[PDB]
Amino acid sequence: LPPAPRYFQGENTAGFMRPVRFEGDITNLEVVGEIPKSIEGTFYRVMPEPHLPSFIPNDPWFNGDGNISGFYFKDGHVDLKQRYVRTEKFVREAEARRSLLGKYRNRYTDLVEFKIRSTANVNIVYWRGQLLALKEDSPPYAMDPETLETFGVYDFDGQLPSLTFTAHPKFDPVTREMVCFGYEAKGDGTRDICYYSFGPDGKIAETVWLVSPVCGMIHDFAVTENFVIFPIIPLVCDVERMKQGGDHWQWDYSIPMYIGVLPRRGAQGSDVKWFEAPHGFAGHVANAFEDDKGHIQLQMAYAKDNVFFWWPDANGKGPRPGEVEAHFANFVLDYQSDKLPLAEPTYLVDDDMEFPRIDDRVATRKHKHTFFCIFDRKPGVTDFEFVMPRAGGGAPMSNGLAHLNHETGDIQRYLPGPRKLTGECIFIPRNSEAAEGDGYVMVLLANYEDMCSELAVLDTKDLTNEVALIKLPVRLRPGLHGNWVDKSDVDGHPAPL
Amino acid sequence: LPPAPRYFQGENTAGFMRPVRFEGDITNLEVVGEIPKSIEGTFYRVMPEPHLPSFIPNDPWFNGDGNISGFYFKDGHVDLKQRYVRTEKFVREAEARRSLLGKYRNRYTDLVEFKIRSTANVNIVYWRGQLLALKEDSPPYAMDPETLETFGVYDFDGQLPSLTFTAHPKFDPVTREMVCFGYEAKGDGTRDICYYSFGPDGKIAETVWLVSPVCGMIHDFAVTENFVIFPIIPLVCDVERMKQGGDHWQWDYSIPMYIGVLPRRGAQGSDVKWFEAPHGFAGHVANAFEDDKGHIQLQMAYAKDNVFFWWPDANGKGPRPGEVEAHFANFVLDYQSDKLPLAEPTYLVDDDMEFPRIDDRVATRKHKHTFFCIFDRKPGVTDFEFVMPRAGGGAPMSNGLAHLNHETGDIQRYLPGPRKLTGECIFIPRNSEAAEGDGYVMVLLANYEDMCSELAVLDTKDLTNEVALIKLPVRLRPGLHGNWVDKSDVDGHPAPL
Ligand SMILES: [Cl-]
Ligand SMILES: [Cl-]
Ligand SMILES: [Fe+2]
Ligand SMILES: [Fe+2]
């Protein structure tokens, strides 16, 4: 077999990116300032964190074993519980004490045959008393919200119709449905999209099979009262390339950014309309809604080039690190229109941004608040001379949060400081009676000065000021998505506005 | 109640001394070099590590909750398990989410009444299939060697005759007895010493009550074939001072360093002879043995002033930090002599030293190898300009290990580097046929450059060279004592030579 390294090497595991790989508990975290005593619930987040050194040199960040953090809040006290998802990969590599899974989404490079290749490392959501650890090439892994025990690969009582489950399901705050899909839904390189939903009782509702015009990456999607929307990243899969040891994904400069629109209820596959947006990168969806005219307003991060630059086109053509900016775009779609080409979107702010969150009490409906990561290159905001040598590589950089009020157009910016970077934030309603976007924001900080992580608590009344700074004595590696589960919500999801 | 701080403050919890307070697992630790594949067993060590900020300002290092590390070795792979001892203090403070136990060994400063005040933070030994977590003011806490679960306070099947159990019991490699004592054995300020032993079947053998000439600290003791030896540190307890909120311990410049000698088997309390060594500090015992003439050779660290300078005399007189050196002393004692005063000891090396270990296969018998911590002020050995600002306070410093061959007088020195310090080492016999002092030495390093801990593996053939350096991504706070439990030893202790 290819030799197993016994320590981490390369930029993707250097400095703040060095795996810690700890599982367990740190109770009664140190707090500077004061955590509001009324906050009760759990912040769950997932990070890719390789458990064993890869036999693949410069293995991408996206290929690391999913490690779940829970921050349990009550009466102004907070405890950390941390545990790896027991994926097939994790368990078999732990048994062998060496890496066995090969390149990102390329089973032809694996040293043994895997049934499930999930690292379960992208999102961690709450559904019917379980956590679901998500990776878009796989079904979810079900976990205990209290102990972070892994129950195992989850098939929704045998109802899961798809080999794949999106990392970005939407929770309808009115119907209490989980709205889902999977792409490559019949295996590697398939153009099959399976759109499916679960009612609050756990019974499957929608199941529609449709066909993508290309085998393109559909990372995120949008849900409105009457439509589901599938934006396709112009990364394209060729299985014959994979069989020769090549990348699952390859940029295609020659195709539009396709945006599929399907009726949400009772549709057949042929009802999808593949609208054609100007060529670009489909970032994360903030939210979508139908306006008075019945037009879909799709608000999402949008770049004009390949954000995933490490997967360039067939001729190795693509941007360099830190070159590509994504902007907060609004696309207008009319399902009734027979005109497939779409106009350039309007932009809601100027900031280089990503990781948009809304008040999920208005998810699938008109929202007027968005919280998002920003990356400001303006001199002094980040001390790059100090941070870059300590940062390692492979992960996106955010040096603040912004709150956009969509009605007033007012923007507040949180800057943690010149030697700190942020992850994706969560929003917490102040209480069950709170107005949209009124309450608390939490975000994990990388402190390059201490080489420690911190959890910031902000009040939406003034996003510039930390109400509390929770000081971890370890690093939590830069991660991906996370969610708030409020103690006052019996089903784990907030009540509609 | 006195207010509970919500973050650590003061020098004793700054820099490398900042509590981490993690419990759980890090498997498959990163290794530079190669762990010898034949090493099979577990290195257990204990550190004081406050679980909650103290309401006592500048609480000494010795007062922190005991946290147990196990390093489990097999086939050149190593896993860390880490867990706090569930002392009465730990459990009640965890339930309250605040500190309740007050000053070191002063129950009159506690915010609630404790039955047991142990932090179980000084030593961690193996006895008849359990770990015993030791603190000289208390009985042991019994723990599971595999899971580090705490069973609870241990009374040896109801046989424990003493309120107190030394942190330095001796294991007779021939008789397989655990030889023990406790001082202040009938409560705070009592001069009662209880000498007691357990046979390998767990049955109590010796129990002798004797009387100390002063209520002095007896931290360590020595055992030979026919004698047990009690060196008294001139720190003295006055319970009336403690009732007013004063220190348990106060230096007395006016007394000798008493060295009690008692027949090991069948003695009465009145058989003890209190020899009087020149005034000084009784450090850790390397080992004691009877020579041809039946004279006790007692080899131990010995200083001429108060090493525990934070507990000065009645007028606040004593040394400053880093002023007092301890030296590797040999005392000669003849139980038959009626002459109480003892000559100044001979010194085996010139190094400022402590934490002596021998090959425990010759414990209580003639030894010819000692491994010990050294602190070398020779310019360049430690980069003090870099280290001191990052070190915090309250813990002793060691910047190397030395191996003394007692026959040849040859000394090898291990220097981890100018920005690293060491803990107490362990010795591992190469195999059951190995000569005395032949095998492996392990020692935990504090790396002030990375602010991480490392576990060094040395071969006794050349102590100057690391065979392996195990790289922890977290800090293990400077700790106290530790022990090797070899897989090849059914009772957890090595076979006699
Ligand atoms: Cl599990
Ligand atoms: Cl326990
Ligand atoms: Fe995502
Ligand atoms: Fe000791």
Which chain A residues touch B25 with a CB distance below 8 Å? 22-24
Phi, psi dihedrals of residue A447, rounded to the nearest 5°: -100, 105
Task: For chain A, count helices (H), then strands (E).
Answer: 3, 34
Chain A interface, best mutation among B27, B80, B84, by max A CB count within 10 A: B27
Three-state SS sequence of B270-334? HHCEEEEECCCEEEEEEEEEECCCCCEEEEEEEECCCCCCCCCCCCCCCCCCCCCCCEEEEEEEC
How far apart (Å, rounded) are the C-alpha atoms in residues B61 and B53? 12
Non-local (6+) Cβ contacts of B339 within 8 A are none
Amino acid identity of A434? Answer: A
**Distance between Cα B460 and ligand 2 center (Å):** 37
How far apart (Å, rounded) are the C-alpha atoms in residues A29 and A71? 10
Chain A interface, best mutation among B17, B18, B21, by max A CB count within 10 A: B21
Domain range list for chain A = 1-497
Closest chain A C-alpha to B50 CA, distance in angstroms? 12
For residue A486, what are the CA distances in angstroms to A28, A395, A423, B367? 19, 29, 20, 64
> Cα A440 to chain center, whole Å?
20
From the list B169, B64, B93, the residue with the least C-alpha distance to B124 is B169
- Which pair of tokens denotes residue A251? 């940029």
Which chain A residues touch B82 with a CB distance below 8 Å? 24
Handedness of CA B58, B60, B64, B70 (dihedral sign): positive
The experimental technique behind this entry is X-ray
Give, as one character, the DSSP assignment of residue A387: H
Least CB–CB distance from B6: residue in A7, A26, A31: A31
Cβ–Cβ under 8 Å, residues B242 and B189: yes
**Distance between Cα A142 and ligand 1 center (Å):** 10
Q: DSSP strand E in A270-368: where?
A: 273-277, 281-290, 296-303, 326-333, 346-347, 353-357
**Distance between Cα A47 and ligand 3 center (Å):** 12
How far apart (Å, rounded) are the C-alpha atoms in residues B458 and B427? 10
Element (H, E) at A242: helix A239-243
From the list B221, B235, B333, the residue with the least C-alpha distance to B275 is B333
How far apart (Å, rounded) are the C-alpha atoms in residues A307 and A280? 9
Q: Give the strands of the sheet with B192-198, arranged side by side.
A: B170-171, B178-182, B192-198, B204-211
Kindly determine whether residue B26 and residue A32, on different chains, have CB atoms separated by under 8 Å: no
The residue assigned the tokens 């049955």 is B203
Amino acid identity of B347? Answer: Y
Alpha helices in B81-147 (DSSP H): 88-96
Kindly determine whether residue A8 and residue B30, on different chains, have CB atoms separated by under 8 Å: yes
Give the ligand with the smallest distance to the CA of B283. 4
From the list B187, B358, B240, B362, the residue with the least C-alpha distance to B290 is B362
How far apart (Å, rounded) are the C-alpha atoms in residues B450 and A462? 36
Non-local (6+) Cβ contacts of B37 within 8 A are B75, B76
Non-local (6+) Cβ contacts of A350 within 8 A are A327
Give, as one character, the DSSP assignment of residue B140: P
Cβ–Cβ under 8 Å, residues A36 and A457: yes
Q: Give the strands of the sheet with B123-127, arranged side by side.
A: B123-127, B130-134, B141-143, B150-153
How far apart (Å, rounded) are the C-alpha atoms in residues B249 and B188? 11
Cβ–Cβ under 8 Å, residues B328 and B301: yes
Kindly determine whether residue B471 and residue A28, on different chains, have CB atoms separated by under 8 Å: no
How far apart (Å, rounded) are the C-alpha atoms in residues B217 and B399? 27
Closest chain B C-alpha to A472 CA, distance in angstroms? 8
**Distance between Cα B277 and ligand 4 center (Å):** 20
From the list A368, A471, A470, A352, the residue with the least C-alpha distance to A413 is A352
Phi, psi dihedrals of residue A373, rounded to the nearest 5°: -70, 145
Kindly determine whether residue A21 and residue B26, on different chains, have CB atoms separated by under 8 Å: yes
Which chain A residues touch B94 with a CB distance below 8 Å? 27
Q: Which residues of A touch B (CB under 8 A)?
A: 6-8, 18-28, 30-32, 51-53, 77, 82, 94, 97, 451, 471, 473-475
Give the ligand with the smallest distance to the CA of A68. 1
Q: Is B448 annotated as a binding residue?
A: no
**Distance between Cα B406 and ligand 4 center (Å):** 23
Kindly determine whether residue A30 and residue B22, on different chains, have CB atoms separated by under 8 Å: no
Task: Give the residue on B whose Cα is nearest the Cα of A30.
Answer: B7
Which chain B residues touch A449 with a CB distance below 8 Å? none
For residue B428, what are the CA distances in angstroms to B35, B36, B103, B311, B460? 13, 12, 37, 36, 10
Task: For chain B, count helices (H), then strands (E).
Answer: 3, 34
Phi, psi dihedrals of residue A453, rounded to the nearest 5°: -100, 155
Q: Is A84 annotated as a binding residue?
A: no
Task: Give the residue on B whose Cα is nearest the Cα of A17.
Answer: B473
Cβ–Cβ under 8 Å, residues B389 and B14: no
Phi, psi dihedrals of residue A236, rounded to the nearest 5°: -125, 140
How far apart (Å, rounded) are the C-alpha atoms in residues B259 and B233? 9
Cβ–Cβ under 8 Å, residues B474 and B447: no
- Which pair of tokens denotes residue B131? 């770990």
Least CB–CB distance from B31: residue in A7, A451, A473: A7
**Distance between Cα B424 and ligand 4 center (Å):** 10
Cβ–Cβ under 8 Å, residues A443 and A456: yes
End-to-end CA distance of chain B: 57
Which chain A residues touch B32 with a CB distance below 8 Å? 6-7
From the list B47, B42, B44, B43, the residue with the least C-alpha distance to B20 is B47
The residue assigned the tokens 């890869």 is A54
Cβ–Cβ under 8 Å, residues A482 and A355: no
Closest chain B C-alpha to A31 CA, distance in angstroms? 6
For residue A160, what are the CA distances in angstroms to A99, A143, A180, A206? 29, 17, 10, 11
Which chain B residues touch A97 with a CB distance below 8 Å? 28, 77
Give the ligand with the smallest distance to the CA of A148. 1
Give the ligand with the smallest distance to the CA of A479. 3
Which chain A residues touch B4 with a CB distance below 8 Å? none
How far apart (Å, rounded) are the C-alpha atoms in residues B190 and A274? 88
* Per-residue buried b or exposed e for A161-176, using 16+ beta carbons within 10 Å of the residue's own CB: bbbbbbbbbbbbbeee
How far apart (Å, rounded) are the C-alpha atoms in residues A248 and A309? 14
How far apart (Å, rounded) are the C-alpha atoms in residues A458 and A430? 11
The residue assigned the tokens 């009782």 is A201
The residue assigned the tokens 């910016």 is A413
Which chain B residues touch A77 with a CB distance below 8 Å? 97
**Distance between Cα B79 and ligand 1 center (Å):** 18
How far apart (Å, rounded) are the C-alpha atoms in residues B352 and B374? 6
For residue B80, what are the CA distances in angstroms to A65, B40, B468? 19, 14, 16
Helix (H, G, I), strand (E, B) or coil at B67: strand
How far apart (Å, rounded) are the C-alpha atoms in residues B478 and B423? 7
Task: Give the residue on A whose Cα is nearest the Cα of B19.
Answer: A473
How far apart (Å, rounded) are the C-alpha atoms in residues B20 and A453? 12
Which chain A residues touch B78 with a CB distance below 8 Å? none
How far apart (Å, rounded) are the C-alpha atoms in residues A32 and A471? 8
**Distance between Cα A168 and ligand 3 center (Å):** 7
Q: Which residues pair with B178 in a beta bridge?
A: B171, B198
